[PDB]
């Protein structure tokens, strides 16, 4: 069993997804307690041209909202902006509100996306946060408001709400405080992503996954100090390695130290030629050490 991207069960989050519409806009929202959060552009008269959010909010009429889980329609008693998200007070407390907290995802970390189409959970899949505050997911018209979440030791964290797609196809969203990841604006403007910085942690993890799968043609037995690696990293768009403590177990199971993989990285970054690793044609940084420790040993 090779390396495949996975998602944590979505059962806890499914009961919180609702359909939110205002006029001709329809997207997904998150119903927790007596609140419903969703992208604010849902109240925009026309999400196709530049939006004056102050005005759209000034002209909003609570009764024009339509919030429903399934057959249960919720009454909106108040609406306010909280960053790029709309926070709606509803007349009913979600009886299936799971125990939860909120937090932001840092570059290189993974989480799950529960993509829904107009209030209906359609799919779930794993993603990894890129350095520019974007993720490579798959969202089609109507999946805005999709929810990102992580389960870390019994704790459910809500961490992402989908807002838009950049011209280059990258997906942009916000945390629940309403701050857009990567600082992008929720406007149909023309904003660029920029050069992404590969996560060294994750790539080293990727290679361990390869070794564990029987591939070692890229093994060099020659090692590169963490210090030398970091200097190289800065000029080649890769993050500086924290230390090697994160892979202690992986280095033991494989017999290859992190320093050896670091040397492999530098050389592999010049190209795989006609060779592949875990069937990929280049370095992959979408899998974290923790993610890889599972998928190979599943001990969490």
């Amino acid at each position: 069993s090779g390396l495949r991207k996975m998602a944590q069960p979505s059962g806890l989050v499914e009961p919180c997804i609702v359909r939110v519409s205002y006029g001709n806009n329809v997207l997904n929202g998150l119903w927790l307690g007596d609140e419903v959060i969703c992208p604010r552009h849902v109240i925009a008269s026309d999400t196709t041209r530049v939006i004056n959010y102050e005005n759209e909010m000034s002209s909003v009429r609570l009764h024009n909202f339509s919030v429903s889980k399934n057959n249960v329609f919720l009454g909106v008693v108040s609406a306010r902006y909280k960053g790029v998200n709309l926070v709606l007070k509803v007349n009913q407390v979600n009886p299936n509100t799971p125990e939860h907290k909120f937090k932001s995802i840092k570059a290189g970390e993974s989480f799950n996306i529960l993509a829904c189409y107009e209030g209906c959970p359609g799919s779930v899949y794993g993603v990894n946060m890129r350095s520019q505050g974007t993720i490579k997911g798959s969202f089609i018209a109507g999946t805005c408001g999709s929810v990102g979440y992580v389960l870390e030791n019994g704790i459910l964290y809500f961490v992402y709400m989908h807002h838009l797609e950049l011209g280059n196809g990258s997906h942009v969203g916000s945390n629940f405080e309403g701050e857009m990841y990567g600082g992008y604006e929720d406007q149909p403007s023309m904003q660029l992503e920029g050069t992404n910085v590969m996560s060294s942690d994750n790539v080293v993890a990727f290679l361990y996954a390869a070794l564990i799968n029987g591939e070692r043609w890229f093994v060099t037995n020659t090692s590169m100090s963490l210090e030398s690696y970091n200097t190289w990293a800065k000029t080649n768009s890769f993050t500086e390695l924290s230390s090697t403590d994160a892979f202690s177990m992986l280095a033991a199971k494989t017999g290859q130290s992190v320093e050896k993989l670091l040397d492999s990285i530098v050389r592999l970054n010049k190209g795989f030629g006609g060779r592949t690793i875990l069937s990929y044609g280049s370095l992959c940084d979408e899998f974290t050490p923790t993610e890889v420790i599972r998928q190979m040993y599943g001990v969490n």
């Binding site: 999400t47 969202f139 797609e165 660029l192």
Partner: peptide, 6 residues
């Protein structure tokens, strides 16, 4: 090219 507010 750029953005679409989904």
């Amino acid at each position: 090219v750029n953005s679409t507010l989904q």
